[PDB]
């Protein structure tokens, strides 16, 4: 089939940067970016910036955001499956984040910080289970690439990138997401409702150093990791 790989990491760890060198390594590699742009301008399929609304008032807008974020991701991921630039021969589909990071990293953290209440979190989990019982199986992952960077590196890369919505994100929030990533992907101690994930191979790339100096090594490790699935 199409091999499906998610790329996971903290805010500003270097996912779009990493994603932008993949297509040139192999004509058979496709990428489904996180639709962060539709989150910044909500429009049917100039509107609200729901990402901005969550960060300005997260106890008001987290559920709405998290629900919209994950639905719009599932849609973009499905559309690239049947998007039949498969046929292909040796096809790999890279997902920028996943429905699993949406729920177990981001939505979970907001619930634990009291930005979703029990009713919101119950609803979200029920929607998320149900959505994946329909429109998953097909989204299942063969592998995960974890781009690992300290919270402080990420706080600096947020400044570098300059996305308006992220400029007030405190270190404390990024550290919370860091530990949840480390639990899921380094220690593999996270309990999820998706049994096969516990067994999915993970490649861990330390991307704290500068991208130019790391590039050659990263590519070797990506190609080798791919060849084993």
Ligand X SMILES: Nc1ncnc2c1ncn2[C@@H]1O[C@H](COP(=O)(O)OP(=O)(O)O)[C@@H](O)[C@H]1O
DSSP 8-state assignment for residue 20: T
By CB under 6 A, tell whether 221 contacts ligand X: no
Site string (133-172) toward ligand X, x via CB under 6 A: ------------------------x--xx-----------
- Based on the residue annotation, tell me whether 96 is a catalytic residue of this protein: yes
Cβ within 8 Å of residue 182, ≥6 positions away: none
For strands 3-8 and 202-206, give the pairing: unpaired
Return the SS3 of 182: helix
Q: Which of 5, 12, 51, 226 binds ligand X (CB under 6 A)?
A: 12
Q: List CB contacts of 157: < 8 A, sequence separation 6 or more.
A: 12, 13, 14, 149
Q: Which of 13, 50, 54, 115 binds a second copy (CB under 8 A)?
A: 50
Taking the complex as a whole, the smallest distance from the CB of residue 223 to ligand DCZ amounts, in Å, to 26
* Residue closest to ligand X (Cβ): 14
At 209 the three-state DSSP class reads coil
Q: Which residues are annotated as a binding site?
A: 9-17, 34, 55, 66, 97, 102, 157-161, 166, 209-211
Q: Which residues are annotated as a binding site for ATP?
A: 9-17, 157-161, 209-211
């Amino acid at each position: 089939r199409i091999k499906k790989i998610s790329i996971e990491g903290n805010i500003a760890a270097g996912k779009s940067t990493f994603v932008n060198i993949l297509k040139q390594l192999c004509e058979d590699w496709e990428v489904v970016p996180e639709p962060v742009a539709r989150w910044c301008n909500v429009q049917s399929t100039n509107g609200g910036n729901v990402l901005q609304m969550m960060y300005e008032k997260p106890e008001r807008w987290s559920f709405t955001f998290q629900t919209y974020a994950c639905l719009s991701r599932i849609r973009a991921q499905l559309a690239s499956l049947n998007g039949k630039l498969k046929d292909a021969e040796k096809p790999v589909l890279f997902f920028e984040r996943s429905v699993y990071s949406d729920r177990y990293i981001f939505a979970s953290n907001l619930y634990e910080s009291e930005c979703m209440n029990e009713t919101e979190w119950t609803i979200y989990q029920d929607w998320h289970d149900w959505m994946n019982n329909q429109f998953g199986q097909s989204l299942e992952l063969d592998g995960i690439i974890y781009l690992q960077a300290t919270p402080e590196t990420c706080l600096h890369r947020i400044y570098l990138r300059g996305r308006n919505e992220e400029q007030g994100i405190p270190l404390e929030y990024l550290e919370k997401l860091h530990y949840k990533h480390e639990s899921w992907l380094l220690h593999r101690t996270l309990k999820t409702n998706f049994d096969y994930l516990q067994e999915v191979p993970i490649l861990t790339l330390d991307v704290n150093e500068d991208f130019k100096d790391k590039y050659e090594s990263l590519v070797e490790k990506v190609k080798e990791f791919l060849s084993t699935l």
